[PDB]
Amino acid sequence: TATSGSCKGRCFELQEVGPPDCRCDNLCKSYSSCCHDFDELCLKTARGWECTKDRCGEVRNEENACHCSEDCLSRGDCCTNYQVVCKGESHWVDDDCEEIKVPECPAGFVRPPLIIFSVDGFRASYMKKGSKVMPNIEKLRSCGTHAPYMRPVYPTKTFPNLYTLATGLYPESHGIVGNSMYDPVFDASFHLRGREKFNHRWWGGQPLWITATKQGVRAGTFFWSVSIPHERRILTILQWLSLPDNERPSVYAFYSEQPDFSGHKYGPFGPEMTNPLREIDKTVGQLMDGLKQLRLHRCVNVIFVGDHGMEDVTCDRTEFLSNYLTNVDDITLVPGTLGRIRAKSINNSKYDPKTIIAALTCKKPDQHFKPYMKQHLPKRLHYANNRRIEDIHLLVDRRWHVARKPLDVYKKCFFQGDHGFDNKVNSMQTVFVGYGPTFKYRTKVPPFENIELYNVMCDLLGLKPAPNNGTHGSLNHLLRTNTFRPTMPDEVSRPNYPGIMYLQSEFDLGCTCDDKVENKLEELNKRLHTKGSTKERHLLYGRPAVLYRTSYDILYHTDFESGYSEIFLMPLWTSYTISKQAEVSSIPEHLTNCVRPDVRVSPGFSQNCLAYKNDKQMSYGFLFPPYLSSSPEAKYDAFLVTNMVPMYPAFKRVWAYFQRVLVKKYASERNGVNVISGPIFDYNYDGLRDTEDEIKQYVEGSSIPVPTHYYSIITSCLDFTQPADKCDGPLSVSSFILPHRPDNDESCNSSEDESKWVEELMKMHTARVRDIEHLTGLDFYRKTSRSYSEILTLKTYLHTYESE
Numbered sequence: 076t077a078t079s080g081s082c083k084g085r086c087f088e089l090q091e092v093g094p095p096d097c098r099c100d101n102l103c104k105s106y107s108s109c110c111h112d113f114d115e116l117c118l119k120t121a122r123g124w125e126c127t128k129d130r131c132g133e134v135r136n137e138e139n140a141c142h143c144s145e146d147c148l149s150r151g152d153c154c155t156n157y158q159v160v161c162k163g164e165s166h167w168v169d170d171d172c173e174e175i176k177v178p179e180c181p182a183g184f185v186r187p188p189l190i191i192f193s194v195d196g197f198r199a200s201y202m203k204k205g206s207k208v209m210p211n212i213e214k215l216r217s218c219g220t221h222a223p224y225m226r227p228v229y230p231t232k233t234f235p236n237l238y239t240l241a242t243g244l245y246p247e248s249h250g251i252v253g254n255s256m257y258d259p260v261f262d263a264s265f266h267l268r269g270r271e272k273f274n275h276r277w278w279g280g281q282p283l284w285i286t287a288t289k290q291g292v293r294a295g296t297f298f299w300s301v302s303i304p305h306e307r308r309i310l311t312i313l314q315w316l317s318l319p320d321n322e323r324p325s326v327y328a329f330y331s332e333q334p335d336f337s338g339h340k341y342g343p344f345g346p347e348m349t350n351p352l353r354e355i356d357k358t359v360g361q362l363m364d365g366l367k368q369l370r371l372h373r374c375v376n377v378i379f380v381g382d383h384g385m386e387d388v389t390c391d392r393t394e395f396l397s398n399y400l401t402n403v404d405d406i407t408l409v410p411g412t413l414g415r416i417r418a419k420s421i422n423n424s425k426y427d428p429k430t431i432i433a434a435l436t437c438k439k440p441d442q443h444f445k446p447y448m449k450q451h452l453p454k455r456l457h458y459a460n461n462r463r464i465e466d467i468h469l470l471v472d473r474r475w476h477v478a479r480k481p482l483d484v485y486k487k488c489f490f491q492g493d494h495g496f497d498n499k500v501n502s503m504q505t506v507f508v509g510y511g512p513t514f515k516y517r518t519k520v521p522p523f524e525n526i527e528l529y530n531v532m533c534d535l536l537g538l539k540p541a542p543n544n545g546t547h548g549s550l551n552h553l554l555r556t557n558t559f560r561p562t563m564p565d566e567v568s569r570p571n572y573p574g575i576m577y578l579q580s581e582f583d584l585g586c587t588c589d590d591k592v593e594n595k596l597e598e599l600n601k602r603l604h605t606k607g608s609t610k611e612r613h614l615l616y617g618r619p620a621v622l623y624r625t626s627y628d629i630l631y632h633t634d635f636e637s638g639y640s641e642i643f644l645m646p647l648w649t650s651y652t653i654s655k656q657a658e659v660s661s662i663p664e665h666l667t668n669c670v671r672p673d674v675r676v677s678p679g680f681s682q683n684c685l686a687y688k689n690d691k692q693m694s695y696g697f698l699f700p701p702y703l704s705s706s707p708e709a710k711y712d713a714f715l716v717t718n719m720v721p722m723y724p725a726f727k728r729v730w731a732y733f734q735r736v737l738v739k740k741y742a743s744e745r746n747g748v749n750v751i752s753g754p755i756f757d758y759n760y761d762g763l764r765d766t767e768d769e770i771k772q773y774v775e776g777s778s779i780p781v782p783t784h785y786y787s788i789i790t791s792c793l794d795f796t797q798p799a800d801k802c803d804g805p806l807s808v809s810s811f812i813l814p815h816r817p818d819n820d821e822s823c824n825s826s827e828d829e830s831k832w833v834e835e836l837m838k839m840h841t842a843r844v845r846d847i848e849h850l851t852g853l854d855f856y857r858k859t860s861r862s863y864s865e866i867l868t869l870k871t872y873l874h875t876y877e878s879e
C-alpha cells in the first residue's frame with residue numbers, strides 16, 4: 076500500500092479505489108490499507124454522539140463526531156438526536172404507531188430503501204424476556220410484521236447464517252459450511268481470525284449486494300470493521316442516505332456483534348445480558364430518530380434480523396474423544412458445538428472411518444453426541460453436498476461441547492454460552508421483524524427459515540433473485556405489496572391409465588399367494604374401485620405432478636391410489652386416507668408371504684420375489700400398509716407386486732411400527748389423515764432426485780433399485796373438528812424422510828420395543844414437503860381450495876417437535 080494519499084473528502088467512499096492508492100472505504104482497516112489520515116478524518120469522536128442544549132445552532136466545527144449546527148440536516152451529518160434536543164421534536168419511539176399505507180419518501184427517491192439491521196446471537200425469546208428494556212425494538216415488532224421466531228440454518232454459527240441471509244442458499248451450496256473450514260482442492264484453511272477468510276473463493280452463490288449492483292441498484296457495505304463504533308456505522312448509513320439520487324444506495328446493512336459477544340461470556344440470560352440489549356435498542360433508536368430527521372421514517376423498509384440464538388454451555392459439559400478412541404492423534408477434530416473429523420495425515424491409508432464411527436457409537440449410556448456419516452445426517456439439515464464438509468460428523472447435544480482431548484479445553488472456565496447446534500433447537504432460534512411501507516401493519520406471521528429472506532429482500536428492491544433454496548412466494552404473506560406472483564410448475568410427464576392387460580400365467584416372478592377363493596353385486600363394485608370410484612377419498616389434493624420425463628402408470632384401488640414407475644419398478648408415490656374411525660387389522664397367517672402379480676402391469680416392468688429370496692441382505696415392505704385394509708377382500712390389493720418396495724430387515728422394524736401403530740394414532744389425534752408415502756434415491760447426497768444412472772445399489776441380481784430413504788407426507792385439517800377428507804379451509808401437515816439403513820445403529824435403544832425408539836427416530840428425520848419435492852421431482856397439493864401462496868407456506872412448514 077502507498078498510504079501517503081489522503082481520505083480528504085472520501086470518508087467511507089462506496090467504490091473502493093484500486094491499489095496502490097490508499098483506501099478510505101470501511102474494509103481498509105481489515106486489509107492494513109487505510110490512508111494515513113483515515114482515523115483523523117473518517118473516525119472523529121470529539122464531543123461524542125448526542126447534541127446537548129448548549130450545542131444547538133453552534134458554529135460548524137468539523138472536528139466534531141456529529142453536528143448540532145443549523146446547517147447539519149442539509150449536510151446530512153447531524154447527531155441523531157438533533158431535532159429532539161434543538162427543535163422540540165419527539166423521539167421516534169415516543170410517537171404512536173401509524174399505519175404506513177404508502178411510501179412517504181422525499182422527491183428523487185425511486186423506491187423505498189432497504190436497511191438490514193442484523194444482530195449477532197439474538198435469541199428469539201429475547202423479544203419477550205427483554206421487552207422491558209428494548210422499547211425501540213418492541214415498537215418495530217408490534218407495529219410492523221413479526222414472526223415468533225426465525226429458524227437459522229445448520230450449523231447455527233455466524234458466517235454460515237449471514238451468508239445464507241445474503242444468498243438464499245444452504246451452506247452446502249454457498250460454501251461457508253462453518254466458522255472454520257479446510258478445502259482439499261484448494262488445499263487451504265478458512266478461520267474467523269486472520270486474512271484467509273477475505274479471499275473470495277470461499278464465498279459462492281450471488282449475495283444480495285451483487286444481485287443489486289448487477290441490476291442497477293446500488294448497495295452500502297455489508298461488512299463493518301470491528302473498530303468502527305456502532306454510532307459511526309449509523310451516522311455513515313444516514314450520510315449515504317443524503318447522497319444525491321444518482322450516487323445514493325438503495326440497500327444498506329448494519330451489524331452488531333452484540334448480544335453474541337456477551338452471551339458467550341455470561342450465558343443467554345446472565346444478569347450481564349440486560350445492558351447489551353439496552354445498548355442495541357439505543358442504536359435502533361438512533362437509526363429511527365435519524366431516519367425521522369431526514370423524513371425517511373415512513374419511507375425505508377427496516378429488517379431486524381438475527382443470525383442464531385445462544386445456549387448455556389460450560390467447560391464441564393465437554394465430551395472428549397480421547398475417552399472413546401485409542402488412536403486419538405491419528406485424527407483432526409473441528410470441535411465445539413458440532414464435530415467434524417478427518418485424518419491428520421492423507422498419506423496414512425490405515426485410517427478407517429468405519430472403525431472411528433463404530434468406536435463413537437452408543438459407547439456410553441448418556442453419550443452427549445452422535446456420530447454420523449454426513450450422507451446419513453437428517454436431510455432437513457441439508458449438510459453434506461460440499462468437499463469442505465468432512466465425511467464424519469458429530470451432532471452434539473444442546474448444552475454440550477465435544478473436544479479431541481482435555482488439554483484442548485484448558486491449554487487453549489471462560490465461557491458460559493455457545494451456539495452451533497442442530498437448527499431445530501429452541502435456544503438456537505433467532506428473530507425477524509419487518510417494518511416499513513412494504514411490510515404489513517401489526518401482523519404476526521408464522522416462524523419461517525432464513526433461507527426465504529433473500530427472495531423477499533429482492534422483491535423489496537425490485538430485483539430478480541438469483542437461483543436459491545428459498546421457495547419464492549412462501550413469504551408473500553409478510554408483504555403489503557411487491558408480492559411475487561408464483562405459478563405451479565408444469566407437469567412434464569403425463570401418466571398412463573392401464574387396464575387389465577396380462578393373464579396371471581404370463582408372470583414368472585416366483586411369488587405365491589394363498590388366494591384361490593371365488594357373486595355379481597360386488598363384481599361391478601370392485602371394477603369401479605379399479606377405475607377410481609374411491610379416488611376422491613384417497614387422493615384429496617390432486618395427483619402429484621411429475622416434473623421430469625419418465626414413464627409411469629396411475630393405479631387405482633379401493634383403499635389407495637399410486638403412481639407406479641415403469642423405470643424404477645415401484646411407486647413414486649402412494650396416496651391413502653385413514654379416517655378417525657378406521658380399524659387396524661393384522662396380516663392373516665396364510666397371507667404372510669403373499670405377493671400377487673398386477674394384471675395391469677407387464678412382467679417386464681414388475682419386481683419379482685426370486686430376487687428378494689436370493690438377496691440375503693434385502694427384504695421387502697409395502698407402501699400402502701396391509702394392516703389398514705378396509706375389508707378382507709380389499710386387503711389382497713395391498714399384496715400386489717406393484718405396492719412392494721425393497722427394505723432391509725432392520726428398516727422394516729421402523730416401517731412396520733409406523734404403518735401398524737403410528738398412522739392410526741395420528742388419524743385418531745388429527746381426525747383423519749391423508750398419507751402419501753414413497754421411495755427416495757439420493758446416492759450423491761445433493762438433496763435432489765437421482766437419475767437411474769446414479770443408483771449405486773440394486774436388489775441382488777435384478778434391476779430393482781434400492782432407495783436411500785422413504786418419505787411420508789401426512790396431511791389433515793388445521794381445524795381438527797373437521798375430518799381430513801371433508802376439510803373446508805387450511806391444512807395441517809407433518810412429513811419425514813427416513814434413512815433406509817441396514818442397521819439401527821443410529822438409535823441407541825433399538826434393542827428395545829419399537830414403542831421406545833421408533834417415533835424418536837422419525838422426529839429427528841422430520842422434513843418439509845419442499846424437501847421431499849426436491850428429492851422426488853414431484854409437485855404436491857396441486858388441487859386444493861387454498862391460494863397458491865398459502866400452499867407454498869405449507870410446503871415450507873417443518874414440524875420441529877420442540878416444546879414452547
Ligand SMILES: *[C@@H]1O[C@H](CO)[C@@H](O[C@@H]2O[C@H](CO)[C@@H](O[C@@H]3O[C@H](CO[C@H]4O[C@H](CO)[C@@H](O)[C@H](O[C@H]5O[C@H](CO)[C@@H](O)[C@H](O)[C@@H]5O[C@H]5O[C@H](CO)[C@@H](O)[C@H](O)[C@@H]5O)[C@@H]4O)[C@@H](O)[C@H](O[C@H]4O[C@H](CO)[C@@H](O)[C@H](O)[C@@H]4O[C@H]4O[C@H](CO)[C@@H](O)[C@H](O)[C@@H]4O)[C@@H]3O)[C@H](O)[C@H]2NC(C)=O)[C@H](O)[C@H]1NC(C)=O
Pocket residue numbers: 244245247248249250276277278279280457460461462542543544761762763849
Ligand atoms: C439450492 O439452490 C442451489 C442454487 O440453485 C442449487 O445448486 C445448483 O444446483 C445445480 C445442479 O446440481 C447446479 O448446476 C450445475 O453446475 C455447473 C455450473 O456451475 C458453476 O456455475 C454456477 C453459476 O454462476 C455457480 O453457482 C457454481 O458455483 C458452485 O461452485 C463453486 C466452486 O466451483 C462455489 O464457489 C459455489 O459455492 C458453488 O458450489 C456448490 O455447487 C457445486 C456444483 O455446481 C457443488 O459441487 C459444490 O459442493 C457446492 O455445493 C459453479 O461454479 C454445471 O457445469 C453442471 O452441469 C453438468 O450436469 C448437467 C446435468 O444437466 C449437464 O448439462 C452436463 O452434462 C454437466 O455435466 C458435465 O460435467 C459433469 C460434472 O463436471 C461431468 O461429470 C459430466 O460427465 C459432464 O462433463 C450443473 O448445471 C448449480 O451450479 C448449483 N448452484 C449453486 C450456487 O450451488 C441446489 O441444488 C439447491 N439445493 C436444493 C437441495 O434444492
Ligand SMILES: CNC(=O)c1cnc(COc2cc(Cl)c(C#N)cc2C(C)(C)C)n1C
Pocket residue numbers: 191192193233234237238240241242283297298299300301328329330
Ligand atoms: C469479525 N467480523 C464480523 O464477523 C463481521 C463484520 N461485519 C459483519 C456483517 O456481515 C454481514 C452482515 C450481513 Cl447483514 C449480511 C447479510 N445479508 C451478511 C454479512 C456477511 C458476513 C456475509 C458480510 N460481520 C459478520
Ligand SMILES: [Ca+2]
Pocket residue numbers: 195196232233234335382383
Ligand atoms: Ca453469530
Ligand SMILES: [Ca+2]
Pocket residue numbers: 756757758759760761762763764765
Ligand atoms: Ca441426488
Ligand SMILES: [K+]
Pocket residue numbers: 687688689690691692693694
Ligand atoms: K432377502
Ligand code: NA
Pocket residue numbers: 819820821822823824825826
Ligand atoms: Na441400535
Ligand SMILES: [Zn+2]
Pocket residue numbers: 196233335336339494
Ligand atoms: Zn457466537
